[PDB]
Amino acid sequence: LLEAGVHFGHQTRRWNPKMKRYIFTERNGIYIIDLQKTVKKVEEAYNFTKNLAAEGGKILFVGTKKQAQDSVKEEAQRSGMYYVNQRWLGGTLTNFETIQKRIKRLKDIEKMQENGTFDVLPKKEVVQLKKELERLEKFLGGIKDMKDLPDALFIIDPRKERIAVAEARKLNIPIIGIVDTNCDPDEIDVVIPANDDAIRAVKLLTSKMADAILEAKQ
Amino acid sequence: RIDPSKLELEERLVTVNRVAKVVKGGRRFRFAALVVVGDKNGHVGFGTGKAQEVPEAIRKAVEDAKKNLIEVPMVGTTIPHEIIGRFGAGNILLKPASEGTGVIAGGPVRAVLELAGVADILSKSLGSNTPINMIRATLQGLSELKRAEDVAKLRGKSVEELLG
Amino acid sequence: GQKVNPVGLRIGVIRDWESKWYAGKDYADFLHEDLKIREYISKRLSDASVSKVEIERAANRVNITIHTAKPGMVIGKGGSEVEALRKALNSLTGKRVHINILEIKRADLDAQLVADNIARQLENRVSFRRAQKQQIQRTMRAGAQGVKTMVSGRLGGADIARSEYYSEGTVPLHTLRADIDYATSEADTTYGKLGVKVWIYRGEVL
RNA sequence: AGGAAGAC
RNA sequence: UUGGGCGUAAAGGGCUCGCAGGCGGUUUCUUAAGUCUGAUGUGAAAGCCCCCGGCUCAACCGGGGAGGGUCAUUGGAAACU
RNA sequence: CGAAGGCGACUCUCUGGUCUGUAACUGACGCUGAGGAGCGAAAGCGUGGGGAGCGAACAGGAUUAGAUACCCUGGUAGUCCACGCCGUAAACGAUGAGUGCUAAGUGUUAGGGGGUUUCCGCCCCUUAGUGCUGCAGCUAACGCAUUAAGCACUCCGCCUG
RNA sequence: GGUGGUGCAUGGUUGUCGUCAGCUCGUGUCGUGAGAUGUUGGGUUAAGUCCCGCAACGAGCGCAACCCUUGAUCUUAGUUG
């Protein structure tokens, strides 16, 4: 539910100030949540992802925050969008020919492990191939069944996945990300300022967006 | 703003260069080819590529130039105003001319401007004579320009009271 | 200071010989005579581009089979080559001969023909780089698993002699069950003398 | 912190 | 000046006090030295350029305009120096 | 702290500046500065002292092919004081002086003001230094970056293989 | 016809570093560029051999295995043993 009141928002006062210039003297001593600008930025994100559902390709997420990775993976598997759960390999959007020929080899090995000749030597093919499947299926993630170029991207943290937005900058992908206050929100007007590490807050916002596109798909 | 590949482009190469590298067994030798690629309708890009074979460097450079394109203002087959392209110790002064002079430019700059399709530009090279630095200077210069109607809509006025 | 010849390294263990017989106490003059057959076959069939010949003894009869991969400009009317070869070979060796021909389907994977193709473009005086790229494209469009090509000598520059290599795919020279076909050809041009070494990884042996 | 040692 | 530079490429005086010199915060009246703009007389004629004519365009020869002025007298403007 | 060179035991006499606060004054008195004048590390020179240690020169012992050097033992001039002189250094931030704008983080030196205190400290402004990271921007890179090598204006000095 | 000169006019062979463990490419990022990355770092190995972070993801020649021989046994095969 859109109530806020859950997250404090940040760590201590070694922070990057981006709103510092015209704030008058306040007796609170810290910023209060701007609920009107919060609800209109959530509304414009809602309308943008309504358009994303209008073309139909929903979203692919990336993250490496291990307190939230299994949670965003199970949310991705529940609600149908795509995910990067473990370490995100570099240059996915630019080496997509190599990625698609690699995922073609995953289709070949995943059909030959069950349909082809299984026993030609008992242990060596097992200890090579099953470990090789485990490596690629843990390091590749849920980007298997695209068969196309991606349309949009969401990031858990711009500082942590810093080069992903650089690749999206180069190949002109519209970008979505929750940012912390040490991040750079200056680039895109579509911004989600909230606590990047509060598991309850990130589950609330990802659940709201997942249900939003679930009711947007029809 | 990336431009699609649905255009006809003339990919006239400008310069290759013999490039060395020293290792324990002597020297390894590659070719660095830079080309300029762009249609006559006002889109220009440049490309660079290193290879052990010259046509391989050519196709790599044309693929990079197809990757990186930028559009120039072409109102009245001549640039709207005077500009100075400034990057990297090459200074290309670009000045519009009357409609019959023809393009007056040094070699790499004339390659870029003729590939753009400008008819009358007087330019002078006030910086270094390095061809890649001339190319980056003249593309920064052509990027710097802006429409008369763009100046009109940003100043909130119309083109007749910009011109007079 | 180079690699040992791969066909000579593979013969006897994986590669069957091109000669399947025994001679006792007359071994020397049978090797002299059957190399006279092999040089005569090469000299009069270089136009027909034999890949290999292979012989056997039939108790004072000899059987020759010749691998040429085309009947077209070779067999003539069909009996012309067998009469003009069998009577001539009878005249040379004085022994009963029999001759048979064999063809290679998917005919661009045989190394001796590939090296002869490179050599033929070198007396055709088209550029060596175009020869390498066209032969690489021909071998991949025929289909293969690996090609390595080498041409050494004075390649048009008079004052320096240097080799050029062009490869694609995997050609391991150190796996034994690999079936490399290797070939060395010699080309004589007005610039001088050029050596071609092409070796092809066709398939695998279990 | 623990030797002087030339030239092609 | 139009049209370069000085950390390491050639190029910051070893540093200060100061004469002459070179620049000068805001406002309000005042003069017109600098500034800008008319009028007159001059910057000879041939030359360069603009427009026409002649030797079988032509090279050239002519006919009419534009100036190469921080030029001299005088009228007007007061924003800036 | 000093304009620079430079200045570290303590006390006294004389004396030059610098910073903070105030708003009580005068009301543009300002910046820069060719020539000029004055300071100016060490070494050096003249005159008179003083000479513990260190120590060019010089001599003995080694090492080396030689070793007029490094290394060892001595050791004169010098280094110290007073009065003058010469006027040079990688005299360095290899960055001329002055004034004004341009994101932040964090120490340190000398202050001023506020929030429960005239208690210890805790936070926030605030100058004037003195550092270290680090945007835009500049650079050919290194790098510089409110102590600019950024964006400007004035004056000076200097360069043209 | 030259076992005559030219290995610095050449192919064809060979040694050497050295059985040393290294040498590169495709695509893509960073750099004005030469270039860099992968191929560095940690733990072991004889090894760039294996694995974990990493603007890298992969591939190729190499390394190791497959080849031969010497190391025990079952079946078949016993002469010229």
What does B53-92 look like in DSSP terms, one character per residue? SHHHHHHHHHHHHHHS-EE---GGGS-SS-EEE-GGG--E
Q: Is C143 left (phi over 0), alpha (psi -120 to 50) or beta?
A: left
Q: How far apart are CA A124 and CA A9, in angstroms?
A: 52
Q: Which nucleotide's C1' sits nearest to the alpha carbon of B48?
A: G33
DSSP secondary structure string for all residues of B115-148:
HHT-S-EEEEE-S---HHHHHHHHHHHHHH---H
Query: Which A residues 66-125 have CB within 7 Å of strand G?
Result: 86-87, 89-91, 94-95, 97-99, 102
For residue C151, what are the contacts with CB-CB under 8 A and spacing of at least 6?
Answer: C118, C122, C128, C131, C132, C163, C164, C194, C195, C196, C197
User: Can you tell me which residue has the tokens 């509060």?
Assistant: A198
The breaks in chain C (C to N more than 2.5 Å) occur after: none
Neighbours of C149 (CB within 10 A): 23
Q: Which residues of A touch B1 (CB under 8 A)?
A: 172
Task: For residue A13, say whether its CB is under 7 Å from any atom of strand F.
Answer: yes
Question: Largest alpha-carbon pair distance within chain B?
Answer: 70
* Cα angle: A138, vertex A139, A144; to 5 degrees: 85
Neighbours of C146 (CB within 10 A): 17
The span from the first CA to the last CA of chain A, in angstroms, equals 21
Neighbors of chain C with 3 or more C-beta pairs under 8 Å: none
Strand B26-37: give its sheet, edge to edge.
B13-23, B26-37, B43-51, B70-71
Q: Which nucleotide's C1' sits nearest to the alpha carbon of B132?
A: G32
**Residue A36 CA to its chain's centroid (Å):** 26
Task: For residue B42, say whether its CB is under 7 Å from any atom of strand F.
Answer: no
Q: What is the number of CB-based contacts under 8 A between chain A and chain B? A: 3
Q: How far apart are CA C123 and CA B104, in angstroms?
A: 49
Separation in Å: G33 C1' and A169 CA? 24
Phi and psi angles of residue A92, each rounded to the nearest 5 degrees, phi first? -70, -40
- The answer to whether B1 contacts A172, with C-beta atoms less than 8 Å apart, is yes
Number of separate helices (H) and strands (E) present in chain B:
5, 7
**To 10 degrees, the CA torsion angle through A201, A204, A209, A215?**
-170
Separation in Å: F153 C1' and C6 CA? 82
Strand A175-179: give its sheet, edge to edge.
A60-62, A153-155, A175-179, A192-193
Separation in Å: F132 C1' and A159 CA? 24
**To 10 degrees, the CA torsion angle through A137, A143, A144, A148?**
-160
**To 10 degrees, the CA torsion angle through B127, B128, B134, B139?**
-30
Query: B64 near B72, Cβ under 8 Å?
Result: no
> Experimentally, how was this structure solved?
cryo-EM
Q: How far apart are CA C104 and CA C41, in angstroms?
A: 18
Among C131, C114, C134, CA closest to C122: C131
User: Can you tell me which residue has the tokens 């991040």?
Assistant: A183
Q: Which three-class secondary structure state does DSSP give residue B10? A: coil
Task: For residue C186, say whether its CB is under 7 Å from any atom of strand G.
Answer: yes
Cα distances (angstroms) measured from residue C70 to each of A120, C39, C76? 39, 20, 11
